[PDB]
Design an enzyme around this catalytic site. Structure first.
Site, PDB file in Angstrom:
ATOM      1  N   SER A  95     -14.822  -2.522 -45.695  1.00 19.54           N
ATOM      2  CA  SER A  95     -15.741  -1.382 -44.802  1.00 19.54           C
ATOM      3  C   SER A  95     -16.182  -0.273 -46.219  1.00 19.54           C
ATOM      4  O   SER A  95     -17.700  -1.440 -45.808  1.00 19.54           O
ATOM      5  CB  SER A  95     -14.495  -0.089 -44.744  1.00 19.54           C
ATOM      6  OG  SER A  95     -14.184   0.759 -44.687  1.00 19.54           O
ATOM      7  N   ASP A 217     -11.352  -0.879 -33.260  1.00 18.57           N
ATOM      8  CA  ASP A 217     -11.704  -0.289 -34.591  1.00 18.57           C
ATOM      9  C   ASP A 217     -11.683   0.838 -34.892  1.00 18.57           C
ATOM     10  O   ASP A 217     -12.608   1.689 -34.112  1.00 18.57           O
ATOM     11  CB  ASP A 217     -12.236  -1.525 -35.888  1.00 18.57           C
ATOM     12  CG  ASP A 217     -12.776  -0.845 -37.496  1.00 18.57           C
ATOM     13  OD1 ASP A 217     -12.134   0.673 -37.652  1.00 18.57           O
ATOM     14  OD2 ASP A 217     -12.558  -1.277 -38.107  1.00 18.57           O
ATOM     15  N   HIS A 246      -8.221  -0.951 -38.605  1.00 21.82           N
ATOM     16  CA  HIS A 246      -9.077  -1.101 -40.157  1.00 21.82           C
ATOM     17  C   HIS A 246      -9.588  -2.123 -40.843  1.00 21.82           C
ATOM     18  O   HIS A 246     -10.393  -2.137 -41.533  1.00 21.82           O
ATOM     19  CB  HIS A 246      -9.882   0.215 -39.813  1.00 21.82           C
ATOM     20  CG  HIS A 246     -10.819   0.552 -40.572  1.00 21.82           C
ATOM     21  ND1 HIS A 246     -12.198   0.436 -40.350  1.00 21.82           N
ATOM     22  CD2 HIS A 246     -11.360   1.257 -42.292  1.00 21.82           C
ATOM     23  CE1 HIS A 246     -13.043   0.700 -41.021  1.00 21.82           C
ATOM     24  NE2 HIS A 246     -12.363   1.633 -42.097  1.00 21.82           N
TER      25      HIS A 246
END
Length: 268
Positions: A95, A217, A246
């Site tokens: 991320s 996601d 995610h």
């Protein structure tokens, strides 16, 4: 260890020089990598660390000015690599850590042989020519819930980020690490991440990138992976995984870990 490494809960597993460094995303910590690390340690020296502001870190060390932009985190990364005397690594970024690694590589491309991105985005907010997955009003909505009732916000946010069933172990674990953050720090970091824009700098990236994400996601539309591939200056490859969530390395390891390993172990 030195203060910088202690402050980021740095772990180094193994000796040698072939080295992998793993950086986690918002609301979690180095434990997000628990299903990947076992498969790396026989072949690589593995470095884990926590981002300043994670619930596992001392809030007295969270400098709101330093962390008002992603560069603060990129300089932390470079500092750790320098303190450990690492001259080259494979960097795996989950991320926001994907973009932190990218920014670090612009300042110190010499330190990175390749970047593997999991669930990465250069921009979460939509505009007339870009789909990121969020209208500014959606993000405005989320900043408000953190202020009023942090616990409620965490319990509502965790299921959306993790996916799958709401009372899964993975959702519970993430809700826990998310709630471990001091609310003011969670809000500040959230704002910094969700309002960031790395699109304009992508053409300057030179270190090769592997772009991996779940097909479902909520924070990363599949078109974002295509955007990254099209606009990064470096050689890149994309693989969209038939997974949900995610934090798919945590919640769907059987389908996701094999993909990550293939991209770590094989070059473009």
């Amino acid at each position: 260890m030195g203060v910088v490494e202690e402050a980021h809960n740095v772990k180094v597993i193994g000796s040698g020089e072939a080295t992998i460094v793993l950086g986690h995303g918002f609301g979690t910590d180095q434990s997000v990598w628990k299903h990947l690390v076992p498969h790396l340690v026989d072949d690589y020296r593995v470095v884990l660390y926590d981002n300043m502001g994670a619930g596992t870190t001392n809030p007295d060390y969270f400098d709101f000015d330093r962390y008002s932009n992603l560069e603060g985190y990129s300089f932390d990364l470079i500092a750790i690599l320098e303190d450990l005397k690492i001259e080259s690594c494979i960097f795996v970024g989950h991320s926001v850590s994907a973009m932190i690694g990218v920014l670090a590589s612009l300042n110190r491309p010499d330190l990175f042989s390749k970047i593997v991105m999991i669930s990465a985005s250069p921009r979460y907010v939509n505009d007339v020519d870009y789909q990121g997955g969020f209208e500014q009003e959606d993000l405005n909505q989320l900043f408000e819930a953190i202020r009023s009732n942090y616990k409620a916000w965490c319990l509502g946010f965790a299921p959306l980020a993790v996916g799958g069933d709401m009372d899964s172990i993975a959702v519970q674990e993430f809700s826990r690490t998310l709630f471990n953050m001091r609310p003011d720090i969670a809000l500040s970091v959230g704002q910094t991440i969700f309002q960031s824009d790395m699109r304009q700098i992508l053409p300057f990236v030179t270190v090769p990138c592997h772009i991996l994400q779940s097909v479902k996601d909520l924070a990363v539309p599949v078109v974002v992976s295509e955007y990254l591939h099209a606009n990064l200056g470096c050689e890149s490859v994309v693989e969209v995984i038939p997974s949900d969530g995610h934090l798919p390395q945590l919640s769907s390891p059987d389908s996701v870990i094999p993909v990550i390993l293939r991209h770590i172990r094989n070059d473009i």
